[PDB]
């Protein structure tokens, strides 16, 4: 199977990033150093050299120097090409505006350059992985901008995202709710189908089953990193029943616009807690069907779902993967819509996962994430609108916008933009 | 003579084909590397009706293998049994369908198709007498289904007068492994009762049930399913392999297993099936053998033929055995369950002698089924079909690449047909 | 030729199944493997009695096992000598009945019938010629009496001709192992005069009444009751196993056994039973052995016969022997005590002598009777019934699982009129 | 045979449990560090694991962390698995309301969960054993809701209990009364049978039979630990005539109410006493049919047996159980009462019981455990509703509760649902 191309936008993204190209090189064996010690697989995501030393295939933008400097000059900078990483002068300062339309456009042309560079060197192309977040500038702003360019000059190739969604009640910036909408309407029509996360649901886990009670970003990240591999797993390691980078869009989204399927990861325990752990694969497959066990803090229950896929991963059983999902389709709580008698997508590769050295998760000898679309997400998007038009009835912040070349009407076209899909929702989540 | 040229596509084709080589060149007794190396003549007599020759002894099979990605292709070769394969034979494109039907079909897959029809045309004038071609694919998925119907097509159009077989994995009843199953196993449907003489529907479901059920060996690979489904069509080609008291034919087949044209969708069977171990507490005669053939347990097919009345049976036997009760049981068989058969048809079983049984064993019999039931199959697509085409669920990925949703509906209306059909001979004599 | 298919239900059964199939065995000298190493040709000639064949000697007793839980059937599989029996015989559920009829008949019991009747059609159709079934269960339990006389009913219907047999255990006089026996034993009945043709009474405290009366073996275990109840079952089947001077047959001793087609409960008997050591001061000729069979100290059934009369009696003599003696003691054993038998019946004996006496003996006489004290052993389940059934003692744990107390009135009514009908032969003619 | 669940609420239940799965790790030689020593029994109590190390299939529930903190912190910390054992953060404090509607309620649903996840793993399922006292909060008030919401999930299984009724003189808390006849109300229409035992008649018999002056709660909940092992021996030990866990309701239960049978064992004999007895079986059967021996302080011969289940143990004639309990249904003393002539169960199990290492009783080669229900039982429900109706004629407690969320006329219904009880009884010891 053939080439993905990364790209890591903002602080978030370019943080993130970085934990999950750390599991490509365990997965891979590839040294940090670069050079491979003395298959088939590491060409869809590293470019080879005359040298032993690959060459990861992502670009990373942020206009504040501070983040990629410590890529940089990490012990990670042999890795990536010094091309590859592209920094500017000035932070975005979780400004909308500033990320899109004044400082975000004054490099973006170069991004585009290198990805032009780099996709003209991939015998194939199956389509792009964005990493970024919601509530910051350059993660939002310049996000929104890749969407337009890459979608013109690569139109009709896989355009795929892991966002960090708004958290519902703790907030780490305060005009979360302005950048927050704003990427969203931009985003809608240039993108396949974002896999939101968030850390407030993160959180929720990793203090209650990883059973670490002081986690940070460096942590967090990581599980995020899980969620990836799994995700790219088809497009590098054998096994029966795979799934390509463009069948997810199809299996999850049954709409142009509904294609916000929220991530589930399972099993995440610690290497302690495990011992007195079986694992069987209903078990692995149950903990994705709870309140209890998501990456985004929307209560299942209170939606349908409508399209669900469950990536296996390791030494697997296809008999009892069968069998294991039947039993979830007759269990009066989940509430499959009515339209979608078929709301299942399995694909196995054979490569259990791997542990970072030092990392809290277990080692798991099988491994499934679970990637539900649901009507639940409404309640998330419902909420974020309530709070755009506490703040917007005011008129409390747009003078920071107006002052970079961001008109007036732009706030009220989103809002209405973001009314429809809050409707649009709600028609698909009845029968006609 | 009789040559036959293997078609596979898809994933699940080319596992099932890959899978499909090993058992045939175990049969005929070739290595790995080409070489024949079996001990009975009777294997060279009828080593071209699958191998061609190249000299030094080195037998290529001629298998054409399509996929729209390089991914399961790549496999095959690295695989222990993936060099007896000519290079050439492998066609591979850059950018694999993504389930959906049109584009394998029409965007991808037509960029595809020239290269391999400009390899099949070589293998059919290769052989002296090309009975006909032989296809393995999966409706759920979109190479195999939209490539599959799209060369099945190509290939119908050059050689209208051949025989073109196909086997093809069905939606299960309950479980799905792709959320598209019903419009990919819907369009690939009606282009496919236009096209191809016979078809052996199977299903994961069922096969599963066998795994566990006749069989005890929890925890069966796709690798083991397609053993199953590869000594099947393994039967269907043996009278041309190999001699036999009554030898059969892809068009002897044909001709008893298909009274009307379009309904020639059958559901395979296959005996004997026994755990190990317990193997030994059972007899191998010839009448319990046949009792295996006629129960729902022993079915490939979810539908259960009980449901629905037997049209046309095959029974295809193999290895030394006794003509009478090969006839006798038949006759037995067709008393015993006479309300399972259709009055209008006098007689339905149809008989084969081989000589030759399947590698480490003296009996087998691939049963092959014409049954009314297998309506329901097709009735219960038509439910999830309508259910989803009702709101437009998935119908922007398919009209994006090239198509019109009037497409659609002509394929659900020929579907209700079809299974109006079948439902018209339900009905007794009078 | 007059193939036994074996039914064994419930603990009870599946244990004397278990040791009755052990004696078997060893009577036609089959090693535990299922490989055939006895000595006689008489054994083989008619070890299709019992016994399939699969190829290589290994020979399959044709005996269905059934419990509602994996508990009696694991140890079975797990036992020395439980290797003989086919894997797929075994019939387990996942929830054994409480003791309680409803649900070993309606609830649990019906969820795992048909499973067993899947498979006891299957050897009624591997046998040239099925003579009739054998059941071995208890009447006390929830599994043995419901799922039997569940299974016995549905066994019935699709093969009403042929016999159909039980050996049951039935609750003791004056001690109880269970403390719901009367409604189980009084719906049992019920649902058995309308069923089987003939029954075979045994109660453990009779059988303990042997152990350390006529042996003097105290500490008998189960393991050791039922080796005496798997001795008088084989004797019944003689004649279809080994050749005699004056055969008999399970339809033989059903007509001449069965006057009337309700009064078909008969209790049985064995001989010679003499303890070890103190066997060389007895003689084994035939005077002292007949003696042995028409005394109250020799029956397996609580009930004396003394206090009743005797209607058909039934001896089924074993080994070398003089025919003289085998009908000139029953002669003189009429007269001795005429009174013990009624007079509007002219003779009451019968006589069947066979070749091949039991392994390790040169002389047995199963002893079959047929007399109206057995209507006291009715009568006193009709005592403990209506005392218990007049407060509704336990009716609550039955009503629960589908059931209504009229059912219980129906079986009270029937079990009363049972009791009459041998209470009016008790009178003499005119 | 398959699986049971043993749910251990309260002080009590906890700590009898700990005692009782002290046995199960002995007569399957299980360690204490949970890896069995290098078979088809310890299925049904234990659940496999892909090491060594079986887990046992059991919860732990008490609101007040430091009871169970010693099993967490003990020695055998390793053989429970972590998530099992549910902590709250204050105590019942042996008020019904607290432990049933106020703070029981806010951690009820966490058990449910591992119930849930627990019961789904078993391919075959019994039943529950509840351990719990009659005199506390949480083992009163909390297992009225388990019982409440285990029938919901799982009913029409098996629900059995082993409980410390208030004995006659002895009291260890002033509001036992009133804790004991509100559970006693809400258990009734949720249970199938319990095995009621004091603590007060087991001293009685320790220093009686036993031999040792100065008990404690570790030595007498290590003989209620025998009888458990006994009860449940037919689910794990091969045997002729075994009894499953659903055999005891249908012989012990002529009446829904009426499930109250007072447990009984033989014979208790210290190791040094034991070398001058003989221990037959009609000795070892005459054991269970005196004053001078049960488990609850009430006078048999005042009161009627109505049924009785003699579950034999160890190597066993059946001709000498059969012959003993005969003789016992013929002494005039002895009275059945005229509606049950079938009043005897037994049951054999081939497995002679183990020793505790340091165990107090002595190591017979075969054991009895009697399980006989009897009207003077109706003597302690008498007794004990006299006390309630002293306290309550004065109201001198009623506001602990009334502050809980507990109204004022749960305490009447309860009394007269117990008078009624009183009543039933009285009708069953007479015949119509
Ligand atoms: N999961 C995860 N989330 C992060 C990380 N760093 C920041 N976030 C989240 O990202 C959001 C803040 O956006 P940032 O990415 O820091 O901001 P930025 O993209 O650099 O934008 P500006 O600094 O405003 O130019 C908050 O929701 C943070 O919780 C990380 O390493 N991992
Ligand atoms: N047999 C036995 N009885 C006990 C044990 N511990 C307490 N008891 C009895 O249980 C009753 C007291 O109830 P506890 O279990 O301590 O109280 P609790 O269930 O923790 O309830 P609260 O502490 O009020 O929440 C008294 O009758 C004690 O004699 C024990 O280890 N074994
Ligand atoms: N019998 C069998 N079926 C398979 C195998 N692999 C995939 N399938 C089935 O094929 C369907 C998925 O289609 P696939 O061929 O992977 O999609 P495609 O590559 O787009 O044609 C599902 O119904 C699977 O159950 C296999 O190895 N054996
Ligand atoms: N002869 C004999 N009788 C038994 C044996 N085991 C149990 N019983 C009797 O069977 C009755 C109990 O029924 P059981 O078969 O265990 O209950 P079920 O499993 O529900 O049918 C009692 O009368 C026991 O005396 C045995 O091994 N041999
Ligand atoms: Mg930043």
């Excluded at chain 2, 078609?7 to 045939?24: T, Y």
């Excluded at chain 2, 006749?214 to 039967?235: F, I, Q």
């Excluded at chain 2, 259910?387 to 209700?416: Q, V």
């Amino acid at each position: 199977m053939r080439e993905c191309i990364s790209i890591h936008i903002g602080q978030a993204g370019v943080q993130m990033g970085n934990a999950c190209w750390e599991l490509y090189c365990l997965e891979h064996g590839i040294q940090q150093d670069g050079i491979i010690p003395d298959d088939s697989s590491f060409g869809t995501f590293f470019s080879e050299t005359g040298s032993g030393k690959h060459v990861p295939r992502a670009v990373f933008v942020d206009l504040e120097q501070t983040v990629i400097g410590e890529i940089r000059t990490g012990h990670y900078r042999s890795l990536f090409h010094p091309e590859q990483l592209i920094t500017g002068k000035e932070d975005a300062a979780n400004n909308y505006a500033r990320g899109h339309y004044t400082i975000g456009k004054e490099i973006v042309d170069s991004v585009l350059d290198r990805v032009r560079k780099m996709a003209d060197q991939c015998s194939g192309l199956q389509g792009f992985l964005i990493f970024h977040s919601f509530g910051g500038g350059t993660g939002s702003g310049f996000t929104s901008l890749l969407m337009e360019r890459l979608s013109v000059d690569y139109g009709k190739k896989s355009k795929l995202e892991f966002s960090v969604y708004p958290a519902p009640q703790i907030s780490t910036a305060v005009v979360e709710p302005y950048n927050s909408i704003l990427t969203t309407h931009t985003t809608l029509e240039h993108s396949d189908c974002a896999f939101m996360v968030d850390n407030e649901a993160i959180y929720d886990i990793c203090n209650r089953n990883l059973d670490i009670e002081r986690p940070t970003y460096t942590n967090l990240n990581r599980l995020i990193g899980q969620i990836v591999s799994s995700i790219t797993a088809s497009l590098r390691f054998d096994g029966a029943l795979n799934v390509d980078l463009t069948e997810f869009q199809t299996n999850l989204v049954p709409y142009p616009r509904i294609h916000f399927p929220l991530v589930t990861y399972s099993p995440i325990i610690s290497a302690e807690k495990a011992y007195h752990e079986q694992l069987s694969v209903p078990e692995i497959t149950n903990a994705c069907f709870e309140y209890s066990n998501q990456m985004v803090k929307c209560d299942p229950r209170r939606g349908k779902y409508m399209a669900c896929c469950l990536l296996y991963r390791g030494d697997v059983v296809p008999k009892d993967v069968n069998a294991a999902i039947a039993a979830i389709k007759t269990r009066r709580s989940i509430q499959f819509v009515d339209w979608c008698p078929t709301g299942f997508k399995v694909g196995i590769n054979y490569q259990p996962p791997t542990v970072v050295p030092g990392g809290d998760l277990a080692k798991v000898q099988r491994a499934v994430c679970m990637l539900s679309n649901t009507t639940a997400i409404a309640e998330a998007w419902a909420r974020l609108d309530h709070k755009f038009d506490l703040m917007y009835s005011k008129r409390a912040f747009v003078h920071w916008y107006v002052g970079e070349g961001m008109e007036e009407g732009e706030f009220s076209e989103a809002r209405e933009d973001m009314a429809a899909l809050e409707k649009d929702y709600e028609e698909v989540g009845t029968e006609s | 003579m009789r040559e036959i040229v293997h078609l596979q596509a898809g994933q699940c084709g080319n596992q099932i084909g890959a899978k499909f080589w090993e058992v045939i060149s175990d049969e005929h007794g070739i290595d790995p590397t080409g070489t024949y190396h079996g001990d009975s003549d009777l294997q060279l007599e009828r080593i071209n009706v699958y191998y061609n020759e190249a000299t030094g002894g080195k037998y290529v099979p001629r298998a054409v293998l399509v996929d729209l990605e390089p991914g399961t292709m790549d496999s095959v070769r690295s695989g222990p049994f993936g060099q007896i394969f000519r290079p050439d034979n492998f066609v591979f494109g850059q950018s694999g369908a993504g389930n959906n039907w049109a584009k394998g079909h029409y965007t991808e897959g037509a960029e595809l198709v020239d290269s391999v029809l400009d390899v099949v045309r070589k293998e059919a004038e290769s052989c002296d007498c090309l009975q006909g071609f032989q296809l393995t694919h999966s409706l759920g998925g979109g190479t195999g289904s939209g490539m599959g119907t799209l060369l099945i097509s190509k290939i119908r159009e050059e050689y209208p007068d051949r025989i073109m077989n196909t086997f093809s994995v069905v939606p299960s009843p309950k479980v799905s492994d792709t959320v598209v199953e019903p419009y990919n196993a819907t369009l690939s449907v009606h282009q496919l009762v236009e096209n191809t003489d016979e078809t052996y529907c199977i299903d994961n479901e069922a096969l599963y049930d066998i795994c566990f059920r006749t069989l005890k060996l929890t925890t069966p690979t796709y690798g083991d399913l397609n053993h199953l489904v590869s000594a099947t069509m393994s039967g269907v080609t043996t009278c041309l392999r190999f001699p036999g008291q009554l030898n059969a034919d892809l068009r002897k087949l044909a001709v008893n297993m298909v009274p009307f044209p379009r309904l020639h969708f059958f559901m395979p069977g296959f005996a004997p099936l026994t755990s190990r171990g317990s193997q030994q507490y059972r007899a191998l005669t010839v009448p319990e053998l046949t009792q295996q053939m006629f129960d729902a347990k022993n079915m490939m097919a979810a539908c259960d033929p009980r449901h629905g009345r037997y049209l046309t049976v095959a029974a295809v036997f193999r290895g030394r055995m006794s003509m009478k009760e090969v006839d006798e049981q038949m006759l037995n068989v067709q008393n015993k369950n006479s309300s399972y058969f259709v009055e209008w048809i006098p007689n339905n079983v149809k008989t084969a002698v081989c000589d030759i049984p399947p590698r480490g064993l003296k009996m087998s019999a691939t049963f092959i089924g014409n049954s009314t039931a297998i309506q329901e199959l097709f009735k219960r697509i038509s439910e999830q079909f309508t259910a989803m085409f009702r709101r437009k669920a998935f119908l922007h990925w398919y009209t994006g690449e090239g198509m019109d949703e009037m497409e659609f509906t002509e394929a659900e209306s020929n579907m209700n047909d079809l299974v109006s059909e079948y439902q018209q001979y339900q009905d007794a004599t009078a």
